[PDB]
């Protein structure tokens, strides 16, 4: 929700950082902070109802009948990697990768035939990544 | 929602950063901060109802009836990488990548046949990425 | 929700950091901080009802009836990696990776046929990653 911050080297509220081979003399330095946060987030107030069937069938006749709910047959992230060779050869090579399914992250939150949802859903990734270094 | 910031090297409210081989003399420095935040985000008030079926068939005759819910057969991120060779050969090479399915991040929130949703959904990614370095 | 911060090297409220071969003399330095946080997050008030079926069959006749609920037959992250060769050979090579299925992080929260949900769902990842280093 709030202040989802990525900071690569350094973070401060205040910084007086002094780096290499420097001379830093006779400084007078003062700081008078009021820093106040009244975070009232993600506050909720709910009256809810969820009803998948009401049925009245009285004096009826219902002879042949068939009923089926929601039907799911997805394929997701589906693969058939096929590598066919005869003289598959690797010789004297320095830095070599033969990579046929690789992931850093899979996040999945709600994967469903059905959902009813009255909430708050937050999904976050923060990262630094190198696949190869071989200098 | 609020303040989703990506910063490469440094972040500060105030900074007096002094770098390499510098001379920094006789400075007078004062600071009187008032910084207040009253974040009231993602606050909610809900009255809700969800229903999938109400039926009243009285005195009727239903001889041959068939009923089917929502039907899903999607293919998502589907692949058939086929490599066919004879004398597949790699020799003396320095930095070589054979990559057939590679993913950094896969984020999926709600993947569904049916959904009713009364909330707040957030999906965030913050990255620095290098696939190959071989200098 | 709040302050999902990724910091690579250093984090501070106030910093007076002095690095290599530097001289820091006769400094007068004061600090007067009032820093207050009143986090009132994720406060809730919920009244809810969930029902799957209500039925009244009176005087009815149900001779050949069939009923089926929600149906799931998904395939997710499904693979058939096939590598076929005759003289598969690796010789004198220095840094060789054969990778056929590799995952760093796999997070799945709710994978279901049906779900009703009245809460808060948060899924967070914070990382630094190198797949190969061989300089």
Author numbering:
A (entry chain B), B (entry chain A), C (entry chain C): 120 to 254
Source paper text:
Here we used structure determination by cryogenic electron microscopy to show that residues 120–254 of the lysosomal type II transmembrane protein 106B (TMEM106B) also form amyloid filaments in human brains. The TMEM106B folds shared a similar five-layered ordered core comprising residues S120–G254 and contained 17 β-strands, each ranging between 3 and 15 residues.
In folds IIb and III, there is a large extra density at the end of the side chain of K178, suggesting that this residue may be post-translationally modified. Fold II was found only in case 19, which was homozygous for T185. We divide the sequence that forms the ordered cores of the folds into three regions according to their degree of structural conservation: the amino-terminal region (S120–T166) is conserved in all three folds; the C-terminal region (Y211–G254) is conserved only in folds I and II; and the middle region (A167–M210) varies between folds.
